[PDB]
Ligand binder design. Structure first.
Ligand SMILES: Nc1ncnc2c1ncn2[C@@H]1O[C@H](COP(=O)(O)OP(=O)(O)OP(O)(O)=S)[C@@H](O)[C@H]1O
Ligand SMILES: Nc1ncnc2c1ncn2[C@@H]1O[C@H](COP(=O)(O)OP(=O)(O)OP(O)(O)=S)[C@@H](O)[C@H]1O
Ligand SMILES: Nc1ncnc2c1ncn2[C@@H]1O[C@H](COP(=O)(O)OP(=O)(O)OP(O)(O)=S)[C@@H](O)[C@H]1O
Ligand SMILES: Nc1ncnc2c1ncn2[C@@H]1O[C@H](COP(=O)(O)OP(=O)(O)OP(O)(O)=S)[C@@H](O)[C@H]1O
Ligand SMILES: Nc1ncnc2c1ncn2[C@@H]1O[C@H](COP(=O)(O)OP(=O)(O)OP(O)(O)=S)[C@@H](O)[C@H]1O
Ligand SMILES: Nc1ncnc2c1ncn2[C@@H]1O[C@H](COP(=O)(O)OP(=O)(O)OP(O)(O)=S)[C@@H](O)[C@H]1O
Lengths: 298, 298, 298, 298, 298, 298
C-alpha cells in the first residue's frame, strides 16, 4: 500500500536511466531540468515552457497555420538571443522575411546572418556548419516544407530530414545552439527529434490585434501540454509588456492592490495601461523585472 | 440424442484446457470469467463488456476513425482507475492531449504520468518498465500508427510490435495493469494479442453532442459482439449519468414508474432530466448506484 | 462402334475404384451421390449444388471479393443447420460478425459457439476438437487469410494449412460435420482438399438489393460448373422465398398459370409478389414446400 | 558437286531410321506425315500445323499468357472432336471452366467428361486410365502449373511429370487419343515429350475482339515455325468463318473476283461480310467447304 | 643475348610439334593458319577472327546473355554459308527460331534443315550423322543448356558432352563443317574443345538499335583476345554495310577523302550514309568489295 | 646461459644444411638470400617480399577471391619483366585476358606469348617446354582450378599437379624463369612447391578505386608473414607512384619536410599529389628512384 509509491519512482528512474531525464514525468511535476534557455520575450510562454524559454543544444519546432505567429515568435527569440549578446542565423527557403518588421520585433537586422539555399540538403548542411562553429546562439529554419530535395529540382525528403536531423541532433546536443524549425500546417523526423513543439494559431476575431494560442504539445525538458494565449498586434508583435505586468503582478514581483500597481515600494501607475506604460518608459526597469521573473521561473 | 449435448461441453472443456478459459463460448452465455476490471464510466459499456469494464492484466485495443471517441473513452478509463486510487500513465506519440478536457473527463492531470518517446521501440520499452513495476493501473498508448521504428527515422514495425507485444503480454498477464492501445483506422500483432477490441465510431448527425456506437468486436473474457450507443457531448464526453439512470432503472436498482423515478423508497424526480439532475447533485448517491450496478453485472 | 461406349464407362469405374465416386463424371450427369446435406436456404443453389446443399463430412470453400455474399451465405447455412436442430460453431479471426444481421438471417445467436483464436494453428486445432466431438453440424472459419501462423506474430502457413487440412480431412470424412472456409480473394491446400468451392460475387448495379452470382467452380459430389444468380438485399440477405416460389413453380410443386399461382388445389395469389407474400404468412407452408423441393432435388 | 545432294538425303534417312520420321526436315518441306488429326476449327491453323489439326496418339502443348486464347483453342478442338462423333475429357485443376462459353464454342457440355483431381499424380493417373480405354478422342489437362504433387499438400513435380509423361507417351502413341496440356507462362518434361507446341498470345489493341498470334514453335509431325494470326472475339471465340472464307478463297475452293465471291458456279455474296454471312446460314455448306479445305491440306 | 631469340622460336616449334599449330603464339602475330572459313557477314569480326570468319572442321562457341546477339550472329553465318552455295542445319532444343527474322538476316529458310530432338544424346547424335555426311557446311546447336540428358526426363550431361564432343571433334576435323554451339550465360567440355569462343553481349543504351561487343576470348586458329563493337538493329541484325564501308575505307579498298567516298576511280557518295546507301543499291558492288576485303584479311 | 645462443644458430645451420637456405629463420631477420628477382611494380610489396620482387627460378602462387587483384598483380610483374628486356608467356585456361587493360598496366601485348591448352597436362607440358628454353622470364598460369585433366573431358589432377610440379620444379630451379600460378579461392601440391605464396583480397569499401591487402603467407626466400595494403583503381591497377613516393620518402631517397617533397637538392612539389604528379611527368626520374629503392631493399 506504500511500497507501491516506491515502485513508481523506481520505474521512473529506470526509464530515465535507459532513455534520459524527461523520458517520463507527472504532468504537474516541477520541471527543474538543468538546461540553458533563450527567452521567447513573453514571460508567460517562458513559464509555460517550464524551463524559461526554448532549450539550447536542442531542436524546437514551431508549427501551425500561416499568419498564426510562428515567424513572429521565432524572430522574438532571436531578438532575445541578440540582446543577450548572441549571434543568430536565419536559413530562408521561403523568401518572405520583412526586416522592417523584424526590427520592430527587436531584431538587429544588420548582424543577422542569412542564407537562402538551393536545396534542402544544402540548407541542413549550412545549418550544420554554423552549429558546429559553436558560436551561434539561434538558427531559424524557414520553413520545413520549402526544404525541397536537390534531385527533385520518391519520398527522399522524408529521408533527407531523418538523415540530416539525426546527424544534426548529435552534434547540436553540445553547442548551446537553439535550432528552430518553422512548420506550416519530413515533419515526422522532426516530430520525434524535436525536444519542444509549439502549436501556434490565432483564435477568435481580430480587433490590428489578434489573439494566438500557443500550446507546448511536446516538451522533453519540462511538463508538456501547458498553453498560453498572447496578444499579437500588427507591426508590433506579441504584447510582451502586458504579459510581463500581468505575470510579475501574479508573482508579487510587482505589487498590485485592486487597480493600483507598485514596484520597489513605489507606485508606478493605476490600471494596467498606465503601469505597462510606466515600464515602457524605463528600459532599466523592464529588464530588471524581466530577469526577476526569469530567475523566479528558473 | 442427448449424449450429444455432452460431447459439446466436453469439447468446450478440452478446447479450454488446451487454450484457456474464453477460448470458445456460446454468444448468449453468461461471462463470469474471474478477472479484475477498470470501469469505463459508462455502465452499459461495462455491461456489454460482460465483465464490468476493461480487464486488468490484459491488452485492450480501442480503434476506429479520428474524432470517433477513442481518446475520450481511454481518458474516461484512467479517470475511473484514478478515482479508485490507482496510478495511470499515458504514452504519447501523437502530441494531442488536451489536459483541460482530460480534467473535464475526471482525470487527475497532475498525477498522470506522461511519456513522449523518440521511437516505437522506446515506447514499448517504457511501457514494459512501468508495467513491470506492478504499481501501474492503466497505461494508454497513443497511438499504434505513430509508433514508428527507430531505424526508420522494410516492415520492421510489424515485427517490432510482434516482438515487444509478445514479451509485454507474458509479463502483463500478472500485474493488474490494464494496457490500452489506441488505433486510428503492427495492428495485426495487436489484433491477436488483444483480449478486447472496441470499435468506436460516430453514427448519424450531431446535435454539440454526437452518438457513438461501440462494439466489442473481440472479447476473450466474455461473450463478444455486444454493442452500445452512447452520447458524446463536446467538452463533456460520454453522458455517464444518462447511461447510469437508464441502466439502473432497467435493473430495478432505481425504481421507475412511468415518468416517475425513485431510489431508496424516496422519489428523486419526474423524467430522466430531473432524475439525472438529482443524482448530479449527490456524488454519494451517484457512487452508490454505480457500485450497485457494477456489483450486479459482476 | 459400340464396345466403345463400354470402354468409357469401364474407365470411369476404374477411375472411381482408384480415386472414389465423383472422381470423374459427365457434366450433364445426374448426381445422385449418397451424402448428407445442409441446405443453403436458397433452393436453386441447393439444386445447382446437385445434392441439395453443402455436403456433410466434407470441406466447402466459399470465396470471392469482400461484400460479395460469402458471410451471408455461410450464416444462411448455419441458420439452416440450427433450424434442423443442429449445433454450429463460428471460428472468427476477422472480428466482423454482426449478430443482429445474423439473427435477421435466421441464426440463433445465443446457441452459436464462437471462438476467436490467437493464431492459425490454434484455430485449426479448435476446429479439430469440435469436429472430433461428432456433435457439431456446421463449423465456419472466417477467414482463410486472417489465419496467420503463431511464430509469425517463410511460408509456414501454406504448410500449416496443408498439415492441418490433411489431418482434419481424414477425421471429418466421418462426422456429419460440414466445414466451411470463407476466403477473401494456404488456399492452395484448400483448393484441393475442398469437395465444393463456391465462387460468390456481386454482378451489375445495386437497386438496397444487389444480385450475386454463385458458381460451383468445384464439386466432387455432383456435376460442377453450375451457377445461380440470387438477390441479396441489405439487412435481409438472399431472397429465399422469391427463389422458392420460382423453383417450386417450375417443378410444378406450386402450379402457375400465367400470373396465377396455386398450391394444394387452392389459389394462393396472383403474381409473384402476392404469392411469395402468401407463403411469408404461413411458416407451415413455406417449410412443406421447402421439404417438397428438397426431396425432389434429392 | 552432285553426290553431295545425295549424302544429304542419306543422312536425313539415317537420322529418321535412328530417331523416326520428323526427326529432321527442311523448313519448307511438304509435311505429308501419315497421322490422324483433330481440327482446331480454324483452317489456317490446321494448315499451319501442316497435317491439318493436332496429331492423335501424340501430346500437344498449348502455352502462353493468361487470357491469350489457350483455353479457347483447347475447347475449339474438343468441339471439333465431338462433332466428328468423338468423346472428350477435361482434367481440371484450375476450376475456371465456363460451360456457357464452352457451348458458345460448340462443345457438347453434357457429354464432356470432367475430372477435378486432388493432386498431380492423380490427374496423370486419371489421364492414363482414360487414354488406355482407347475410346477417348481428346483429353485436355488444365493446367500444367496447377498439377501440384500429392506430398506437397524438393522438385518432385519435375520428376512426377517426367515419370508419368514417359509412361503416358508410350501407351498414347497407339490410341488415337490427342492429349492437350495447357501451360500458363515440369514443363521441361513436356517441352521434350510434346510433338507439337503452340505459342498463343494476344497482339495489339482490342476492338470485344482481339487478335492472337499462334506459332508452331515445335512440330515433330510437320515443318515447325509457321504462324497464324486469328481473331478472338469475346464470348464467341476465334472467328472460324472469316478464316474459312479467306483460306478457301485462296485455294480457289470458293472463287473470288474482286469483291465477288461464289461457290459451285453460284454467287454467294459480295464482300467477305456478306459471304461469311451466306455460309453462316448453311451448315451443309460450311461443313462441305470445311472438308474440302481439310482434304486439300491433307 | 641473341641465341635467346632463337631458343624462343625453338620452343614455340616444339610446342607446336607436340600440340599442333596455334598451341602458342604472340598476341600481335599475323595469324596465317591455313583453314577454310565461313564469313560472319561483318568483315570487322572476320578481321578480328584473324582467319576471316569461323573455321571449318572446328567447333565454335558463341556465348553470353540472352538478347545479346548470339542467335543473330549464328544465323548471319548460315546466311553466309548458304549464299556461298552451302547447306546448313539448325539443331533446336530452344523452340524460339523466328523464320521471318531469319529471312531478314538473309537465311534461305526453306532450305534450312531443322531438327528438334527429344534429348541431348539425340541432338549430338543427329549432329554427328549430318557432319559425317560431309555435305553440311554449318550446323548450329541451340542451345547448350537446353541439351538435357535422356535419363533425366547426377551430372551426366557434363559427361554426355565430354563423351560426344570428343567423338564429334575427331570426325569433324575433316569435314569442312563449321559447328556452332550457342551458350546462354557441359560448357566445360565445350570450353576446351572449341577452337573459337565468342563473347557476345550488348553494351550501353539502345537507340531500335543496340551496340554489342564481341570478343574472341578463345582462338586456336589466330591470335585471341581481339574485339569488335557492332550495331544490332531490331529486325535487321548487325549493320554489315556500315561495317563494310568502314573497314574497306580503312584498307583503301574504297577511297575516302574527308567526307568523300569513291570506288573504282568513281565517286560513290559523300558521307557514310550516302555511300553505304550507294552500295546498298548494287549487290554486284557489295559482293565485290566483300571479296576484296575477305581476300585482303586472308 | 650463453652457449645456448650457440646451439640455436648451430641447429639453424644443420637445418639449412639438410634442407637448404630459408628452411628456418627468425621472423625479424634480414633476408639477404642471393636470388634474382622480378619487381611487382609496387616497391612496398617488393620490400615486403624481402628480396625485392618475386624470385626467379622458383614458383610463386598468387591466390584469393575473384576480383581481388591476382591477375592485376600478375600482369604488373610481366610488365616489369618486359621493361627489363625480358620475354613473358601467359598460359590461359580461363579465357578472360583483357589486352587493353594489360596495356594499361604496362604490358607489351604484342610480344606477350599466349597459349590456351586443351587440358591441364598440356598446359604444364607447354610450361615445361618454355622454361626449358631458358629464354623465358615470366610464365603466368591462369588458373590452377581451370587446369582440368585430359581424361576428365577420381582425383587425377591432384596427382597431375604433383607429378608435373615435381618435374617442373627441378628444371626451373636453374632457368631464371619466374613461374606464377594464379589460384581462385591440386593446390596442395602447389602449396608445398611454391617458394612464395601471396594472399590477395580487397578490404573495405570501394571509392573506382579499392584497397587490397597482400600478405606473404609463405616465403622460403625471406621472412614470411609481412603484408602490404595497396590501392587498386579501376582500369589503372595498383597505384605504383603513390607507393613509390611514400616508400622513397621513408627511406630518405626523396626528402620530405612536412608537406614539402624534394629530390636531388631540388624541390619537386608540395603534398603527395603534386609530388607523385611531378614524377609522373619524368620517366627518367621515376625509373631512377625506382632503381634506388630496389637497390636499397637489396
Ligand atoms: N511584415 C509584417 N508587418 C507587419 N505585421 C506583420 C508582418 N508580418 C506579420 N505581421 C503580423 O503578425 C501576424 C502573423 O504573421 P507571422 O507570424 O508571419 O505569421 P506566421 O505564423 O509566420 O505565418 P506565415 O505562413 O509565416 S506568413 C500577421 O497577421 C500580422 O498581424
Ligand atoms: N479537447 C477537446 N475539447 C473539447 N471537446 C473535445 C476535445 N477532444 C475531443 N472532444 C470531443 O470528443 C469528440 C471525439 O474526440 P476524441 O475522442 O479525441 O476522438 P478520437 O476518437 O480520439 O479521434 P482522434 O484521432 O484521437 S482526434 C470530439 O469530436 C468532441 O466532441
Ligand atoms: N451487418 C450487416 N447488416 C446489414 N446488411 C449487411 C450486413 N452485412 C452484410 N450485409 C449485406 O450483405 C452484403 C454482403 O455482405 P457479406 O456477405 O458480409 O459480404 P462478404 O462476401 O462476407 O464480404 P466480407 O469481406 O466478409 S465483408 C452487404 O453488401 C449488405 O448488402
Ligand atoms: N467465359 C468466357 N466468356 C466470354 N468470353 C470469354 C470467356 N473466356 C474467355 N473469353 C474470351 O476469350 C479470351 C481468352 O480467354 P481464354 O482462352 O480462357 O484465355 P487463356 O489463354 O485460356 O488464359 P487463362 O489463363 O486460361 S484465363 C478472353 O479474353 C475473352 O475475350
Ligand atoms: N525475331 C526477331 N525479330 C526482330 N528482331 C529480333 C528478333 N530476334 C532478335 N531480334 C533483335 O536482335 C536482338 C538480339 O536477339 P538474339 O540474337 O536472339 O539474342 P540472343 O543473343 O540469341 O539471346 P537469346 O537468349 O537467344 S533470345 C534483339 O534484342 C532484337 O534487337
Ligand atoms: N579488364 C579490366 N578493365 C578495367 N579494370 C579492370 C579490368 N580487370 C580488372 N580490373 C580492375 O582490377 C580489379 C581486380 O580485377 P583482377 O585482378 O582481374 O581480379 P582477380 O583477382 O584476377 O580475380 P579474377 O577471378 O581473375 S576476375 C577489378 O575489380 C577492377 O577494379
Amino acid at each position: 500500500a506504500k511500497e507501491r509509491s516506491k515502485a513508481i519512482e523506481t520505474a521512473m528512474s529506470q526509464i530515465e536511466k535507459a532513455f534520459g531525464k524527461g523520458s517520463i514525468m507527472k504532468l504537474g511535476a516541477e520541471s527543474k531540468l538543468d538546461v540553458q534557455v533563450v527567452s521567447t520575450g513573453s514571460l508567460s510562454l517562458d513559464l509555460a515552457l517550464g524551463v524559461g524559454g526554448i532549450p539550447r543544444g536542442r531542436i524546437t519546432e514551431i508549427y501551425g497555420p500561416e499568419s498564426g505567429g510562428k515567424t513572429t515568435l521565432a524572430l522574438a527569440i532571436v531578438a532575445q538571443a541578440q540582446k543577450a549578446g548572441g549571434t543568430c542565423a536565419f536559413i530562408d527557403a521561403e523568401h518572405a522575411l520583412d526586416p522592417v518588421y523584424a526590427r520592430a520585433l527587436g531584431v538587429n537586422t544588420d548582424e543577422l546572418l542569412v542564407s537562402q539555399p538551393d536545396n534542402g540538403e544544402q540548407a541542413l548542411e549550412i545549418m550544420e556548419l554554423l552549429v558546429r562553429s559553436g558560436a551561434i546562439d539561434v538558427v531559424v529554419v524557414d520553413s520545413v516544407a520549402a526544404l525541397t530535395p536537390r534531385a527533385e529540382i520518391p519520398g527522399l525528403q522524408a529521408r533527407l530530414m531523418s538523415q540530416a536531423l539525426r546527424k544534426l541532433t548529435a552534434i547540436l546536443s553540445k553547442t548551446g545552439t537553439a535550432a528552430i524549425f518553422i512548420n506550416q500546417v519530413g515533419g515526422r523526423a522532426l516530430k520525434f527529434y524535436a525536444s519542444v513543439r509549439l502549436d501556434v494559431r490565432k483564435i477568435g476575431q481580430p480587433t490590428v490585434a489578434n489573439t494566438v494560442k500557443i500550446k507546448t504539445v511536446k516538451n522533453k525538458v519540462a511538463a508538456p501540454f501547458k498553453e498560453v494565449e498572447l496578444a499579437l498586434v500588427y507591426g508590433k508583435g506579441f504584447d510582451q509588456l502586458s504579459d510581463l505586468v500581468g505575470l510579475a503582478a501574479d508573482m508579487d514581483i510587482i505589487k498590485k492592490a485592486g487597480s493600483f500597481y507598485s514596484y520597489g515600494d513605489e507606485r508606478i501607475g493605476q490600471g494596467k495601461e498606465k503601469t505597462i506604460a510606466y515600464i515602457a518608459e524605463r528600459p532599466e526597469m523592464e529588464q530588471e523585472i524581466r530577469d526577476r521573473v526569469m530567475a523566479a521561473i528558473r
